[PDB]
């Protein structure tokens, strides 16, 4: 239908989650669906065990990738009244949240209610300090864009020249944690490849190495983010306290699972 | 040594090099509270709306992190370190007593 403009005047949809996590979930769910489809082709009573193995493997892989790309390592959230925009003395009541990941920081500003001052307050901004990316340039672009005051404040808190040294320590921690997680993912790939080979011992040792590298990434992130001097984040009349987020605990449980699986495989081989 | 300059200038004749001001050009008490919000938070104690002070309430907290106060060594005695440098809004506030 024509004769009117625009042809599609409806609001343009927004993706309801992170695209990298969604893509990882979709790929691994497709693999799981294919394996479930071929499951009756797995002959004998082994299939159950097979199913478990397959699921475990996929989960591990997915977890690693998700944990490498999720900004859920250092999370914090407060409910505050704060100034919203320039040339306006009105304040907004909103939840302000910090989500520090390996490659950057996601600052969330969700209005309570979302519709305040005739504006939609559901900001989720990203500021990346990955190698080759200039954090100061991104903060300057955010300033020129005119982001709300809490977002600009939390972004300036992580600038390289800010008085509190969160930028350097967090960048180092995220970089080396991501490197260790990539090593763990490569070890997971090698373990999956070598478990099909007749030598199951090397596959078990590779799975144990995957768990070890996940735990090493955890330890490096903790040690590098703990050495920072206390940086007080004060918004409105409240203070934002950060803590290890869901990504940290997912990495912990996945690394422990891999370590235990490799140890059990080695012990079972030694005993049998 | 030459000072900081605007990165968008200083490459072609029609746009010669222009220096960049390292503090806010406004007369907005930046030498008292700092030229950034993080600087202000570093200068604040977040108690009773007062600027942070050390053991003596009449003096602000000593600069501890190296990103806060200019630490030019003492020309007379060669003393270095922020052990005796107070934290102000201006980075070079301890140039002279």
């Amino acid at each position: 239908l024509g004769h009117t403009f625009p042809f599609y005047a409806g609001p343009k949809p927004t993706f309801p989650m992170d695209t990298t996590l969604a893509s990882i979930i979709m790929i691994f769910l497709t693999a799981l669906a294919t394996f479930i489809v071929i499951l009756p082709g797995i002959r004998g009573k082994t299939r159950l065990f097979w199913l478990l193995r397959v699921v475990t493997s996929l989960f591990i892989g997915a977890a690693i990738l998700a944990v490498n790309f999720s900004s859920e390592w250092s999370v914090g959230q407060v409910s505050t009244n704060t100034s919203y925009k320039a040339f306006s003395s009105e304040w907004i009541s909103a939840d302000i949240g910090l989500q520090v990941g390996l490659g950057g920081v996601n600052i969330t500003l969700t209005g309570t209610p979302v519709q305040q001052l005739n504006e939609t307050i559901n900001y989720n901004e990203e500021f990346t300090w990955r190698l080759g990316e200039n954090y100061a340039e991104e903060y300057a672009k955010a300033l020129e864009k005119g982001l709300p005051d809490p977002v600009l404040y939390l972004a300036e808190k992580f600038t390289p020249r800010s008085p509190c040294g969160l930028y350097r320590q967090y960048r180092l921690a995220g970089h080396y944690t991501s490197a260790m997680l990539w090593v763990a993912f490569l070890c997971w790939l090698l373990a999956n490849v070598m478990l099909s080979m007749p030598v199951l011992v090397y596959g078990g040792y590779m799975l144990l190495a995957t768990g070890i590298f996940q735990l090493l990434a955890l330890l490096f992130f903790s040690m590098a983010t703990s050495l920072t001097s206390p940086c007080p984040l004060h918004l409105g009349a409240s203070v934002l306290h950060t803590h290890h987020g869901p990504a940290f605990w997912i990495t912990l449980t996945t690394g422990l699972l891999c370590v235990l699986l490799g140890l059990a495989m080695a012990v079972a081989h030694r005993m049998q | 040594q030459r000072s900081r300059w605007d990165p968008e200038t200083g490459r072609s004749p029609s746009n010669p090099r222009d220096p960049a001001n390292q503090v806010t050009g406004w007369l907005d008490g930046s030498a008292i509270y700092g030229s950034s919000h993080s600087w202000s938070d570093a200068l604040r104690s977040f108690s009773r709306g007062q600027l942070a002070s050390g053991p003596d309430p009449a003096f602000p907290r000593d600069s501890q992190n190296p990103l806060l106060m200019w630490a030019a060594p003492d020309p007379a005695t060669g003393q270095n370190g922020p052990r005796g440098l107070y934290a102000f809004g201006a980075e070079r506030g301890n140039r002279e007593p």
Binding site: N81, S83, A86, F87, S88, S89, W91, L143, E144, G146, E156 | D6, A20, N21, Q22, V23, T24, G25, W26, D28, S30, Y33, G34, S35, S36, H37, W39, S40
Partner: peptide, 28 residues
């Protein structure tokens, strides 16, 4: 009521002018 009834001045000098946000700002 909110004791802060005015628009708090920014420490970095940004958004002081309505159309020239970088006027008087740090680094300008």
């Amino acid at each position: 009521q909110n004791p802060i009834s005015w628009e708090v001045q920014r420490f970095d000098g940004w958004y002081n002018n309505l159309m020239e946000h970088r006027w008087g700002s740090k680094g300008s």
